[PDB]
Amino acid sequence: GTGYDLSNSVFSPDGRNFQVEYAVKAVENGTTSIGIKCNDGVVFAVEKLITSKLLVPQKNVKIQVVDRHIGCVYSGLIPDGRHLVNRGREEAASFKKLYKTPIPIPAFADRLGQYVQAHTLYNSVRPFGVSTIFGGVDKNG
Amino acid sequence: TQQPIVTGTSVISMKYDNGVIIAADNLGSYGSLLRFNGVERLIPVGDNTVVGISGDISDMQHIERLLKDLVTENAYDNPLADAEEALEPSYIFEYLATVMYQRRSKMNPLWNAIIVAGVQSNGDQFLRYVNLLGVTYSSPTLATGFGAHMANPLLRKVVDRESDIPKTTVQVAEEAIVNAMRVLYYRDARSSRNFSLAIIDKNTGLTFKKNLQVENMKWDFAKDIKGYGTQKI
Questions:
Q1: What's the CA gap between A115 and A112, in Å, rounded?
Q2: Contacts of residue B75 in chain A, CB cutoff 8 Å?
Q3: Which of A104, A127, B79, B227 is most buried, judged by most C-beta within 10 A?
């Protein structure tokens, strides 16, 4: 058969979700962004394409902050990255409200992962067109 | 909150030529029981604002969490969060007052009286009061509970009108605040000897004095009081 790539959450005969891979294609077409885990922390870096010199320098920030200890950078559709960061901020807020301590990095990672994966379960929603490098320092380093 | 349980008493504050000063005793009373000592009731918001809270301590901790999350959310996507777009005292107070009036209008009030003190970005002093009813007002001197009956007379002796603010040095204001705290310890049954004080000045930083104690207590004349009228020995 054919037509497997037209709808989201549809398995192809080889067991793939082609809409997710097209989202990955959209990601690869984005600007470069990297993260480096060091001995006692993390560093995030991103390239911002200066399309013209009419862009105000040092503005148009791409790196976003979650809570006060999590840093997130993304490549792909910037609006989808902002959406994912907002969801993660809500997750971190609820975690702090219930459990008092700021959300650990693995917990936050699983929150974001469950959100993104849920966006690949239904044909009524589009997969996320971003790849996200995030992290920070918690009680475990 | 439909009835307060663990409560905190007076919070007092006054303006002076360069800024504001605010004090509150470190006591959480459980009815008539001075149960919890060492309860910080002055919450610095950043480096230019201090919120003094009186009343239900659980609602005070709720307000603390709200202020923390407000600072956090102000930091989001805001490179000037440490500069031009930092949280101002007027912003924090208007948020608190909106919350208090909404809770009052839902018949579920935050059983507190709040004094937001600080210095604006333009150096202007901010000193305003909101309570569980949503009533808001500002004055050169502000006080909650018993302070509003006893501390305010002593503080208005120092700063009676707006014109007296530029004439009020920080030494005079701090001395007045400490004397008012001593008077409150004298005549308030739900007050503590230990208190905390906070000075927010436009020229220096935020100074947060903890573990202060009421001193210079006049009790000697009590040895000469005998009986309740006719007792001679």
A1: 5
A2: 65, 68
A3: A127
Of A61, A64, A68, the CB nearest to B72: A68
* A105-118 vs A78-99: helix crossing angle, rounded to 10: 130
Q: Do B76 and A64 touch (CB under 8 A)?
A: yes
Where in the sequence is the domain holding B181, given as residue range(s)? Answer: 1-233
Q: Please report the resolution in angstroms.
A: 3.0
Is residue B230 part of the annotated active site? The answer reads: no
Q: Which of B69, B75, B79 sits opposite A61 (nearest CB)?
A: B79
As for how many domains chain B has, the answer is 1
Please, which residues 104-163 of chain B have a Cβ atom closer than 8 Å to chain A? none
Minimal-distance CA residue of chain A relative to B62: A97
Joined tokens for residue B89: 């005292």
Q: Which strand (E) or helix (H) includes residue A60?
A: none
Q: Is residue B61 classed as helix, strand or coil in its secondary structure?
A: helix
Residues 6 or more apart whose Cβ sits within 8 Å of residue A92: A66, A67, A70, A102, A103, A108, A111
> What are the φ and ψ backbone dihedral angles of A133, each rounded to 5 degrees?
-105, 120
CA distance A74 to A70: 13
Chain B hits for A61, Cβ within 8 Å: 77, 79
- Is residue B11 within 8 Å of residue B115, measured between CB atoms? yes
Residue B97: give its domain's CATH number.
Answer: 3.60.20.10
- Cα dihedral A39, A68, B211, B165 sign: positive
